[PDB]
């Protein structure tokens, strides 16, 4: 009896077996019906994302994603495997119940559990108190956590994440005459972003370096032989995280949302939050982002405050890894919701 961990994101499903060090299955959270990699290759049906900004919004398509996960990706019988799922911070109660109902009634799992994504990322770093910045394809959150409890008044949601950065790179690539328009082309630009982009330690100074020579330029070649060369676009793209005005958003940037979130917590915990800033999710992978965040938070915090940013190399899968850890601890085993409990009490048991 081996537990499964399924971490459902706006852009990517990460799934696998509890006890493994990484998800074996990672695929696009897309329904075209076709699911995942199948759907993109056969773009031609239309593509829908059943999770928007971290929240499940299309339950029929979400069910196809879970089915594809169990049967085609992991090749398991779900009725034999306790299953740990993940949810966004502030996921409405109704959504949690419906996830529980689908798992027990449609997939017949013997047991299940739903954990908050940011909390899992904190656990993966060995911590039970800290503040997580979780930034994926569709949403970014700041989640302060006290001994495993996400502090609900201090959680911040920011609708600025990887897909917005990809779209912004598509826009600014036109300055050099390049044209990427198609959804297929968006996938190309996504990969360019991932390969060439970085966070400047100081933006204004980096802009000056980029204007004064070509030393910051890098190139990416498409299969047809087109060479895409960019300079300041490399760091302007993720700068958006720190300056959302780049894409017409009024919001504060991620450094400030981190600070604001800490400031909505009791003063007596702020020290431990400042010293345990954990970075999670694919959009935190930009080289230089940890050092920039350290600098920005330092500029916002009390002058004597010890500031520490933890950015693990595995952080594209930290949520998933935290679930894998949690689900295989002997001390967690009594916390599964069992099919017997669901059978007697129904969906609302999940809030227990």
């Amino acid at each position: 009896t081996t537990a499964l961990v399924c971490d459902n994101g706006s852009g990517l499903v990460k799934a696998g077996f509890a006890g493994d060090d990484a998800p074996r299955a990672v695929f696009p959270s897309i329904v075209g019906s076709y699911v995942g990699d199948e759907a993109q290759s056969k773009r031609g049906l239309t593509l829908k994302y059943p999770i928007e900004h971290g929240i499940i919004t299309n339950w029929d398509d979400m069910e196809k994603i879970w089915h594809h996960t169990f049967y085609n990706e992991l090749r398991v019988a779900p009725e034999e495997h306790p299953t740990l799922l993940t949810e966004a911070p502030l996921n409405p109660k109704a959504n949690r119940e419906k996830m529980t109902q689908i798992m027990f009634e449609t997939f017949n799992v013997p047991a299940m559990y739903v954990a908050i994504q940011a909390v899992l990322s904190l656990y993966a770093s060995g911590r039970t108190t800290g503040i997580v910045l979780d930034s994926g394809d569709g949403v970014t959150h700041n989640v302060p956590i006290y001994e495993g409890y996400a502090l609900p008044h201090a959680i911040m949601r920011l609708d600025l994440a990887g897909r917005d950065l990809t779209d912004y790179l598509m826009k600014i690539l036109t300055e050099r005459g390049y044209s990427f328009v198609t959804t297929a082309e968006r996938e190309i630009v996504r990969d360019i972003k991932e390969k060439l982009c970085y966070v400047a330690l100081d933006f204004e100074n980096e802009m000056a370096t980029a204007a004064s020579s070509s030393s910051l330029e890098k190139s990416y070649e498409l299969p047809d032989g087109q060479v895409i060369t960019i300079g300041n676009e490399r760091f302007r793209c993720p700068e958006t995280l720190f300056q959302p005005s780049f894409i017409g958003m009024e919001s504060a940037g991620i450094h400030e949302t981190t600070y604001n979130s800490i400031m909505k917590c009791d003063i007596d915990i702020r020290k431990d939050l400042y010293a345990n800033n954990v970075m999670s999710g694919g959009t935190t992978m930009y080289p230089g982002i940890a050092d920039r965040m350290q600098k920005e938070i330092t500029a916002l915090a009390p002058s004597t405050m010890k500031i520490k940013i933890i950015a693990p190399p595995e952080r594209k899968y930290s949520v998933w890894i935290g679930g894998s850890i949690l689900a295989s601890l002997s001390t967690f085993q009594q916390m599964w919701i069992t099919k017997q409990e669901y059978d007697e009490a129904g969906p609302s048991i999940v809030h227990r």
């Binding site: 493994d20 060090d21 656990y123 495993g148 595995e314 601890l329 001390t331 916390m335």
Partner: peptide, 22 residues
């Protein structure tokens, strides 16, 4: 308590290095 045992296990889990290599 229940939670202190889980919390302690999380602190001493050793992270991904103690999980199975895929």
């Amino acid at each position: 308590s229940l939670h202190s045992a889980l919390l302690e296990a999380i602190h001493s889990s050793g992270g991904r290095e103690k999980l199975r290599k895929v």
